[PDB]
Structures are given as structure tokens and as C-alpha cells.
């Protein structure tokens, strides 16, 4: 019985550090980013990134556990699965990231490149809006590397001629024309120990087919059902002066009941008043040695 105990004591479970810096990028594929933002925090005093307060977690747990009807049996299983999945992470392993609505840097695009974008957006070319999230953790001396998890989502721009013309006019610089991107950054995301950003499919299913405004998913492909619970984004261009500076303002909008207790209430910026962009991250801190 010595080899068994030797194997048991030799193997243990490690712990990876809580991730530090989170970056977001919104762009059109093959072109400079439309909206680049990043957030780093001290986790105890900063507001752009911090651990979830116990009150918010308790409210979210109560809202998730009270989401069922007393008639259908399958809703019980969905609510139970959602609550069980949420209970796996304590209030220390869940963080909140608040991206500033305004773009960090002025739009660095050439006139010829913008004309090329307008031409590509004109006749028949299918361009995809690209949204990238990236989480990076502090360096660990154990493994001579910095763990980094990145995820990119592509959404089509549709073939409607009047929509493409409006988007082209908005990109040109015409005031009073916004850009609407459905199926954007998820409210809840999960970062694994080594893989890529994986969606909380249980909470996604609960949001999709457990609230009072049920979202229709009849005519949709399999790859779209998991994306059907994302929130929409709206991008507006503010110029002000003649040239040399062009700002992009991005605002999020949840699907369905915008005042449901399931969603975490957002905060307002202390310098401009525009609401933040909220992302709730679930962190796994266990790797099998």
C-alpha cells in the first residue's frame, strides 16, 4: 500500500491568481478598431474592476432562484441547474468589470482606408463586426508564462440595402445616425484555468426561455441559440471639431425585460454621467497539477 499513498501525496491541487487586466475591442474585420478599451484595478479600491459585493450576489441568487412557474415541470430543472451552477463560485471568485463608454484613443484611420471601408460596405460584400474580450492574470513564478484568455465573436451585418446605406452614412461622418450591433458582449462570462472564455450556458438558457418576455428561437441555427441571450450595442460618432479627432460612444442594451431582477444594476460615470459597460466574470482557480 505504499505506492498508492505515495501517488496520493505526490499529487495535489494548485491555485492560479485572480486575473488583473481586461481589454475589449469592437471593430470591423480587417480594419483598425472602432472602440478599444482596457481596465486594470487594485481589486480593493478601484471601481473599474472589483470583487462582487455580498449584497449583489445575494440579490442575484434570489432573482435566479425565484424565476419559475408552478405549472411546467422542466422550468424547475432549469432553475435548479442555474442555482447549482451559480453556487459553485463564492463571492471572491466572481468579479465585475466596468468599461468606460467613451473610446480610449482617437480613431487612427486614413482617409483612403475609410473610403475602402465605404466601398466594401456598398455593393455585395459581407463584412462581420468583430468583438474581442481579453483577460490577463499576474505573472506566476511557477510557470514561466503569463496566462491569457481571449475570445472573439463575429456577427454578420445582414444584406438589407437600407441598413447598409445607413451604416455607410454613419461611418462617413453624417451626424444623427447610429450603428446597431445585435448579439454583442455577454453580461455573464466565465474564464477557465487554461481554455478560452466559455459561456454560462445554464444562465443563458434561463434567460432565453425562463423570463416573461420569452425570446423566440424557432428559425435559428444551433450556433445562434447560445448567442441568442447576448445584449445589443449601439455606437455613435462624436466629432466636435473639424478633423484629427473622432470619438466612438458605445452603449449596451439588455434583451427582453430591461428592468428584470436577474441583471446586475449598472453604475453611472462620475465624470460624464454616461452608464458603464458591465461584465460579470466567473473565475476558475484550480488546475490539476
Amino acid at each position: 500500500f505504499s505506492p498508492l499513498l505515495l501517488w496520493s501525496l505526490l499529487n495535489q491541487i494548485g491555485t492560479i491568481s485572480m486575473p488583473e487586466k481586461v481589454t475589449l475591442r469592437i471593430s470591423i474585420e480587417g480594419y483598425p478598431p472602432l472602440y478599444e478599451m482596457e481596465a486594470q484595478g487594485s481589486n480593493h479600491d478601484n471601481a473599474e474592476l472589483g470583487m462582487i459585493k455580498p449584497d449583489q450576489l445575494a440579490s442575484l441568487n434570489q432573482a435566479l432562484t425565484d424565476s419559475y412557474t408552478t405549472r411546467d415541470t422542466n422550468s424547475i430543472l432549469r432553475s435548479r441547474m442555474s442555482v447549482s451552477y451559480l453556487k459553485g463560485y463564492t463571492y471572491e471568485d466572481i468579479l465585475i468589470v466596468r468599461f468606460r463608454p467613451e473610446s480610449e484613443i482617437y480613431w487612427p484611420i486614413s482617409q483612403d482606408s475609410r473610403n475602402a471601408m465605404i466601398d466594401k460596405l456598398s455593393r455585395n460584400t459581407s463584412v462581420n463586426f468583430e468583438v474581442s474580450l481579453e483577460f490577463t492574470r499576474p505573472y506566476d513564478p511557477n510557470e514561466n508564462a503569463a496566462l491569457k484568455h481571449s475570445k472573439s465573436w463575429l456577427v454578420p451585418i445582414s444584406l438589407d440595402m437600407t441598413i447598409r446605406a445607413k451604416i455607410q452614412s454613419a461611418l462617413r461622418g453624417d451626424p444623427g445616425h447610429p450603428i446597431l450591433i445585435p448579439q454583442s458582449i455577454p453580461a455573464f462570462i466565465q474564464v477557465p484555468n487554461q481554455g478560452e472564455l466559455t459561456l454560462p450556458t445554464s444562465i443563458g438558457n434561463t434567460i432565453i426561455n425562463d423570463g416573461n418576455p420569452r425570446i423566440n428561437t424557432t428559425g435559428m441555427e444551433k450556433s445562434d441559440e447560445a448567442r441568442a441571450w447576448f445584449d445589443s450595442l449601439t455606437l455613435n460618432l462624436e466629432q466636435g471639431k473639424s478633423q484629427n479627432e473622432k470619438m466612438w460612444i458605445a452603449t449596451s442594451e439588455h434583451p427582453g425585460d430591461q428592468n428584470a431582477k436577474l441583471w446586475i444594476k449598472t453604475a453611472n460615470t462620475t465624470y460624464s454621467g454616461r452608464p458603464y459597460l458591465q461584465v460579470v466574470g466567473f473565475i476558475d482557480r484550480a488546475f490539476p497539477s
Binding site: 500500500f1 498508492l4 499513498l5 501517488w7 496520493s8 501525496l9 499529487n11 495535489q12 491541487i13 484550480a286 490539476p288
Partner: peptide, 18 residues
Amino acid sequence: KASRIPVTLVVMLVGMTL
């Protein structure tokens, strides 16, 4: 996880053999 075999398993096997 649960991939690692715990020491309780081996100590209880030893107890069973005893």
C-alpha cells in the same frame, strides 16, 4: 475535479485489510 485519489481511500483500505 475529483481526479486525484484522496488519502482517506488508502487509509481506509489499510483499515479494511487490518
